[PDB]
Design a protein around this ligand. Structure first.
Ligand SMILES: [Cu+2]
Length: 460
């Protein structure tokens, strides 16, 4: 019965198996050259930014906000949007949508430089030790007497966050659920693993390794630095301003500067207005001199949706494609790989070269974004007869970039199974155009293989 009221715990039907992610990757890529395209010398590098992007945009949305799902994630991923209301996952699953719903008609993305979509990525803080994440959702298709079920909740429900994990959204600690008088360095330290246990319980054993400092409270940074599962942090003061082409040190347990760009009081401007201005000023510098545009957000709204679309239209897929729009965790891992992994390329015979690279995360927990870009200098796409890869490589896209050759190498161990889960969701909901688009997007992440061919056939 469609029209009967139900009050449900939002749930998604699969979550990427973060707990099973392998920590160590051994990449072996074999390149076979055409007969009259024998080259003399090849050498390799991991570039400063993934996909050979020019500049970095980092976004972390604080306070575990309902709008991180209903506005930020939904706008990025081509989902139904509202101007004043707040969908939960169960509303989207059931087609119970608010009375002003609309869609942008596209996802918001860059490319990877080798012909594939890379949707914008961001992180949200999590109030994992707060029982309000267990709030129910009222679903009632066709009910128009009121729209109370679409009002803003005080925070994300777990099911919303679980689904966001399937799209690579990151997580961070923020406020912990202690009495204000108990927010001492030592007591906060003891409460971090309590919150972590709930994160792991709900997010298929993903370990959170980031703190977004709350309310300028430096006791949170002091405590987090004694909890070795936290590897990266952000704050507005007491931090390091990130210049991606200049930064040379270890950034393990480093507080990276982030700004909210609040507008002057009564000036009628919005935080997106302020960030847009800061971006324009920063782009006037050569890329090597640019800071990262490292932002925080609280509640997102229609103005934020339009700003994300502006970024897509100006510096993303529908503009000059110069931006890497990602979350701080993915960037942290990439920087770690660039610092510690050393790609090598060796000639096997006159027309065969073997590219090797080891991706090893830190000892705390498996890294969750084990993908890199490797540039090969001296090679062009037109030289290549075939490229093969070993089992640790699950996604592989490549082609010319400027006067050299780039490979985008994804080693997420369960990526093919994850793409198939999106295919199964589409097969169970074959009239959902967004479900078909998601299936095509995840299947296009996979390297050429029998399984990719199978999944492509199922989503024609
Ligand atoms: Cu906050």
């Amino acid at each position: 019965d469609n029209g009967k009221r139900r009050d449900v715990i939002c749930e998604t039907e699969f979550i990427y198996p973060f707990g099973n992610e392998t920590a160590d990757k051994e990449i072996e890529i074999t390149i076979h050259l055409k007969a009259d395209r024998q080259v003399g010398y090849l050498y390799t590098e991991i570039p400063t930014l993934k996909y050979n992007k020019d500049w970095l945009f980092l976004m972390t949305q604080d306070d575990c906000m309902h709008s991180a799902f209903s506005y930020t994630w939904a706008a990025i991923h081509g989902k139904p949007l509202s101007y004043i209301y707040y969908c939960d996952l169960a509303h989207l699953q059931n087609g119970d949508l608010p009375p002003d719903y609309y869609s942008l008609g596209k996802t918001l993305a860059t490319t990877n430089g080798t012909g594939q979509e890379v949707r914008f990525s961001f992180g949200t803080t999590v109030a994992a030790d707060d029982d309000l994440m267990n709030t129910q959702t009222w679903v009632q298709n066709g009910y128009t007497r009121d729209y109370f079920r679409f009002y803003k909740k005080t925070m994300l429900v777990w099911g919303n966050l679980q689904e966001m994990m399937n799209y690579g959204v990151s997580i961070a600690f923020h406020d912990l659920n202690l009495p204000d008088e108990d927010k001492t360095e030592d007591k906060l330290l003891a409460q971090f693993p309590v919150a972590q246990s709930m994160i792991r319980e709900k997010l298929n054993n993903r370990t959170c390794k980031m703190l977004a400092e709350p309310n300028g409270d430096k006791n949170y940074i002091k405590a987090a630095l004694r909890y070795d599962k936290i590897r990266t942090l952000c704050a507005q003061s007491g931090a390091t301003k990130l210049y991606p082409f200049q930064e040379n040190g270890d950034i393990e347990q480093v507080v990276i500067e982030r700004a909210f760009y609040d507008p002057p009081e009564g000036s009628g401007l919005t935080n997106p207005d302020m960030i847009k201005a800061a971006i324009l000023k920063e782009m006037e510098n050569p890329k090597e001199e640019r800071a990262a545009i490292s932002i925080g957000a609280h509640n997102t709204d229609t103005g934020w949706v339009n700003f994300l679309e502006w970024l897509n239209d100006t510096y993303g897929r529908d503009g000059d494609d110069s931006m890497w729009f990602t979350n701080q965790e993915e960037y942290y891992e990439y920087y770690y790989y660039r610092l510690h992994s050393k790609p090598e390329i060796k000639q096997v015979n006159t027309h065969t070269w073997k590219l090797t690279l080891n991706l090893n995360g830190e000892d705390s927990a498996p890294f969750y974004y084990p993908s890199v870009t490797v540039n090969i200098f001296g090679l062009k796409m037109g030289d290549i007869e075939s490229i093969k890869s070993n089992e640790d490589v699950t996604g592989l896209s490549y082609g010319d970039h400027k006067d050299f050759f780039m490979l985008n190498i994804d080693c997420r161990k369960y990526l093919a199974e994850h793409a198939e889960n999106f295919v199964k969701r589409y097969e169970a909901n074959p009239t959902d155009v967004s479900a078909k688009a998601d299936a095509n997007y995840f299947v296009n992440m996979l390297k050429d293989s029998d399984k990719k061919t199978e999944l492509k056939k199922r989503i024609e």
